[PDB]
């Protein structure tokens, strides 16, 4: 299973962010508002969660062979991931997620504060003009082979377009001492 593919728990669905390593042990990063739901996922057991404030969580794979260090492009191909980086305003990016597949756009702001009402407030989010829909959360924000973020939320949809916010992946990697595969 690669970045952007579906991960579920009971009736809930999110998308996988990035497969990572923690001291050689395979894990998967996804959104914290997703891992807050349950400790038991289709791919394994949750070992960390942070939402709101942040929006990241990590799951240890039950099957280490499934930790595919790529992003699925929803066209039968995959993008290889080799590093993690920080986004910059004006950067051309792509997002992969299980509801809408692959979409592209550009970064329009950094360190945005996002109020999700009853769900709380998240800080320091990457802002983009890429569309997303429910189910896309936790999925991959990347530029070529560089991992940049995890889908958190936004407004609109993929027919009318909208604004989306992402948790910077470097903060999630350092929280857990993880490195992207």
């Amino acid at each position: 299973i690669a970045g952007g593919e579906a991960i579920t728990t009971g009736g809930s669905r999110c998308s996988l962010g990035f497969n990572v390593s923690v001291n050689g042990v395979a894990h998967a990063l996804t959104a914290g508002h997703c891992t807050n739901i349950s400790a038991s996922w289709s791919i394994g057991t949750r070992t960390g969660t942070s939402f709101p404030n942040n929006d990241y969580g990590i799951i240890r794979h039950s099957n280490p062979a499934a930790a595919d260090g790529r992003v699925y492009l929803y066209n039968g191909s995959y993008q290889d991931i080799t590093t993690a980086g920080n986004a910059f305003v004006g950067q051309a990016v792509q997002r992969s997620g299980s509801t809408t597949g692959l979409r592209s756009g550009s970064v329009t702001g950094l360190n945005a504060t996002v109020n999700y009402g009853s769900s709380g407030i998240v800080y320091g989010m990457i802002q983009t003009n890429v569309c997303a829909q429910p189910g896309d959360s936790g999925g991959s924000l990347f530029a070529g082979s560089t991992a940049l973020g995890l889908t958190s939320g936004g407004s609109g949809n993929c027919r009318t377009g909208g604004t989306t916010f992402y948790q910077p992946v470097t903060e999630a990697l350092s929280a857990y001492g993880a490195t992207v595969l």
């Binding site: 959104a31 508002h33 996002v114 999700y116 769900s119 958190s152 936004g154 407004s155 916010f165």
Partner: peptide, 4 residues
């Protein structure tokens, strides 16, 4: 905005 809302969580996806």
């Amino acid at each position: 905005p809302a969580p996806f």
